[PDB]
C-alpha cells in the first residue's frame, strides 16, 4: 500500500495521551502507523513546491570581450585616460610599461598604460529565493486493506491527496470507507528557508546556502536588474596579460560551468523547470486520529476456501506480503487470518494490515503481517478450506534492536533536533532530550561547521586522543559525547 518495498519503512505505534502522535517524514521515506484500533495508514511526502520566487542576484558564467582598446602615456606625466573608461561595461586596468625613444615619447622611463574592453555575458545563473509562506507541501495518505495491485506503486489513485500550506489549518482528510484523519502540520520550521537560494543554471537547479551563494567569486548583478550590462566584479572573469614590459591585452577567462559543477558537491539537486518543485527535506506532522473507523465491523465472518495467487514473499525486514484469492459466499466478508506456532495454540506475531476484507469476490486482496523470529504458520480461512502456510523468518535476535539503534542514530544524524519526534508526549524524557539536544546541537553546529568529510574524522581523532590521555575522569566528557560522536558523524555526512 505504497509503503511496502521502500527501504525506509519506519513503523510508528502508540497513540497515547489523546488520540494524536508525532511523526516526521522525508521525501525518500514513507511512514506506517499502527494502533490497537483505528486501522493502519501510510504517509509519504511526494513533493515540496515553492510558488512565487524572487531573484536576488544573477551570476554570469560565460562572457566575451569586444572593442579592445588601449592607451599609454610618456613617463612621469601621469596616467592615461580613455573615453570608454567612463562606462562600467568596459573592464579596465592600469599598468606600467617602459618607454623610450623607440616608443616615440622620450624621458627613458616607465610609463603607464590602460586597456578597455566591454564585458558582455552570454550565460546567466540566476539564484531565486522564496519566503517561508506560499510554499506548498504535498502528502499522500493511503490506507491498508490491500485490494489487488496496490502495494508499492507510485502511480495510480489509491490514496488521499491533501496539500499543506503554512496558510492552512487542521487539514481535514476525509478518506473513504474509513474515518477522517486530521494533520497539524508545521511547515514553517521544516526546511528553514530564508537561507535557501534556489539557483538555476542552464537546465538544472540546486538548493544552496545563502551566505555561500552571496560571496561566490563571479561577475554578479542585482536581481531586480533589467538591461543586464552593469556587471559588478567583472575582474573575476577577465585577466590582463602583461608578459614583458610591453603592451598588455585582455582575454576572457572561459566558461565557469564545469567549475561551478565542481562548486556544487554537497547541494541537493532540485527541479526548477515548469514549477519550482523540490524533492528533499522533511516536515513535522502532528497526526490526530480522533475519528477513524475500521471499515470491517457489520460484515459477517467468511466461510472458507481461499487460494494463494502471489507467494508469501518477505520484502524488507520481516513484514511478509501474501496475496490470496477467494471463491464463494455472500461476497462482502472478512478474512480469518492469524499467525500461530506449529501446535495451533499461541497467537504470536502481529498483523499489520489489520482487519482484512473481501469485496467483489473475484479480485485478490493481499495481506501484510509481521511474523516472529523463526518458525510461524500463517493460517487463512476456516477448517474445511484452511491454508496453513509455513514461514521461517530468517533468524534474527537481539540484533533487531541494534539495527533499530542504527536507524535511530542515523535518524538523529540526518535530522538534528526534529528526530526526537516519532514520540507522543514523552513528557519527562522526550522534552528534556529535545531541549538538551537543541543546546548541544546548537553549539555543535556553527562551531564545528564548514569542515568536510575528512576534518570531522581528524578532529574526532584529536579530541578522542587528548581525552583518552587526560586526567581527573574528564576522559568520559571528551570521549562519550564529542569523540566517538564526531567520529560517527564523520562517516555519515555527504548523504
Amino acid at each position: 500500500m505504497r509503503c511496502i518495498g521502500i527501504s525506509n519503512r519506519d513503523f510508528v505505534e502508540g497513540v497515547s495521551g489523546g488520540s494524536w502522535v508525532d511523526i516526521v517524514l522525508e521525501h525518500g521515506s514513507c511512514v506506517t502507523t499502527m494502533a490497537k484500533n483505528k486501522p493502519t495508514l501510510d504517509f509519504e511526502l511526494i513533493e515540496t513546491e515553492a510558488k512565487q520566487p524572487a531573484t536576488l542576484r544573477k551570476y554570469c558564467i560565460e562572457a566575451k570581450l569586444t572593442n579592445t582598446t588601449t592607451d599609454s602615456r610618456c613617463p612621469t606625466q601621469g596616467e592615461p585616460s580613455l573615453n570608454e573608461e567612463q562606462d562600467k561595461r568596459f573592464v579596465c586596468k592600469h599598468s606600467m610599461v617602459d618607454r623610450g625613444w623607440g616608443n616615440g615619447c622620450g624621458l627613458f622611463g616607465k610609463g603607464g598604460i590602460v586597456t578597455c574592453a566591454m564585458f558582455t555575458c552570454k550565460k546567466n545563473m540566476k539564484g531565486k529565493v522564496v519566503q517561508p509562506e506560499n510554499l506548498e507541501y504535498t502528502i499522500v495518505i493511503t490506507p491498508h486493506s490491500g485490494e489487488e495491485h496496490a502495494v508499492g506503486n507510485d502511480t495510480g489513485k489509491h490514496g488521499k491527496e491533501i496539500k499543506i500550506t503554512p496558510q492552512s489549518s487542521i487539514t481535514e482528510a476525509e478518506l473513504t470507507g474509513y474515518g477522517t484523519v486530521t494533520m497539524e502540520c508545521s511547515p514553517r520550521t521544516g526546511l528553514d528557508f530564508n537561507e535557501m537560494v534556489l539557483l538555476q543554471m542552464e537546465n538544472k537547479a540546486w538548493l544552496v546556502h545563502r551566505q555561500w551563494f552571496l560571496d561566490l567569486p563571479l561577475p554578479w548583478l542585482p536581481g531586480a536588474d533589467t538591461q543586464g550590462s552593469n556587471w559588478i566584479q567583472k575582474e573575476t572573469l577577465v585577466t590582463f596579460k602583461n608578459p614583458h614590459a610591453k603592451k598588455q591585452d585582455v582575454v576572457v577567462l572561459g566558461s565557469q560551468e564545469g567549475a561551478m559543477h565542481t562548486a556544487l558537491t554537497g547541494a541537493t539537486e532540485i527541479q526548477m523547470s515548469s514549477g519550482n518543485l523540490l524533492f528533499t527535506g522533511h516536515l513535522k506532522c502532528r497526526l490526530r486520529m480522533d475519528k477513524l473507523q475500521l471499515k470491517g465491523m457489520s460484515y459477517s465472518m467468511c466461510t472458507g476456501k481461499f487460494k494463494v495467487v502471489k507467494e508469501i514473499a518477505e520484502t524488507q525486514h520481516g513484514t511478509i506480503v501474501i496475496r490470496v484469492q477467494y471463491e464463494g459466499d455472500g461476497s462482502p466478508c472478512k478474512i480469518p487470518f492469524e499467525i500461530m506456532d506449529l501446535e495451533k495454540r499461541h497467537v504470536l506475531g502481529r498483523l499489520i494490515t489489520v482487519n482484512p476484507i473481501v469485496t467483489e469476490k473475484d479480485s485478490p486482496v493481499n495481506i501484510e503481517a509481521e511474523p516472529p523470529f523463526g518458525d510461524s504458520y500463517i493460517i487463512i480461512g476456516v477448517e474445511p478450506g484452511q491454508l496453513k502456510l509455513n514461514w521461517f523468518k530468517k533468524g534474527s535476535s537481539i540484533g533487531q534492536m541494534i539495527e533499530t539503534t542504527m536507524r535511530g542514530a542515523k535518524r538523529m544524524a540526518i535530522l538534528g533536533d526534529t528526530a526526537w519526534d516519532f514520540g507522543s508526549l514523552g513528557g519527562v524524557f522526550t522534552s528534556i532530550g529535545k531541549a538538551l539536544h537543541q543546546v548541544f546541537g546548537a553549539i555543535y553546529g556553527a562551531a564545528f561547521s564548514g569542515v568536510s568529510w575528512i576534518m570531522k574524522i581528524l578532529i574526532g581523532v584529536i579530541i578522542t586522543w587528548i581525552g583518552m590521555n587526560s586526567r581527573s575522569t574528564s576522559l568520559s566528557v571528551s570521549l562519550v559525547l564529542v569523540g566517538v560522536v564526531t567520529l560517527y558523524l564523520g562517516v555519515m555526512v555527504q548523504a
Partner: antibody
Amino acid sequence: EVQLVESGAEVKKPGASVKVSCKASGYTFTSYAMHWVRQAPGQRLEWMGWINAGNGNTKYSQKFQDRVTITRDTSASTAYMELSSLRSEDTAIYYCARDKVDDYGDYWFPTLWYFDYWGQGTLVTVS
Amino acid sequence: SALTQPASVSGSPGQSITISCTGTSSDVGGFNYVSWFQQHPGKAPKLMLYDVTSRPSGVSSRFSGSKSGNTASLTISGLQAEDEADYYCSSHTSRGTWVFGGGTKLTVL
C-alpha cells in the same frame, strides 16, 4: 467635502505652450501632493505626474523629462501645468490628482492610497 | 515600463469576472503598491481599490483583488449593469514613477 476643480482650454497650435490650472478645496495645500494624469481619446492613461509638496521639490516625468516644467502657489492653492513644445499627439484630457504627503514635510514614499479625489478633466486640443 | 491588462472582457449578470494585469519585478513583483480605477466614459476615473486587497470607503464589497507575483488579478463577483465602464490598473515602480494599464472594456449584455 473635498472638491477639485480645473481650468479648461479650447484649442491650441503646435509650437505653442498650454497652461492649465486647478483649484484645490476642502483641505489644506501644504501637506498634499498633486499629480497629473493624461487621458488621450481611446488610449492608455499616461503619466505627466509631478510630486508637488509644501516646499516645491518636484520630480519630472521620464518620457517628458526635458520637455515640460510646472509652477505652483500656496496662497491660491493652485498647481499649474506649463506644457511647452506642443505637438499633434498632445491632445488629451488632463486630470489633477490629489495625493498625500508624509508628516515629516518631505515626500519620500507615497501613501497606501494614491488618488482619493480627482479633477473633472480638461480636454485640450491642438490645431 | 507599462502594464499589460487585456483589451476587453465580458460576462453575464450573476457570474463573476476576473481581470488580470502583468508587470515587471520593479512595480508589482516585489511591492504591494497596486490599485485599480473605474473610468466611466463621462467621469473622472474613480478609486475602487487601495492596496492589493483593500478598498476605499463607499466602494461596495463586490470588488476584491489579489496578487500572485508579477500578476495582480481583480475579481468582480456578481456583476450588475452598473459595471459597464473601463478598468485601469496602477503600480508604483521602485524607480519612483507610476505606470497605468491599457484598459479593459466590460459589458454584461
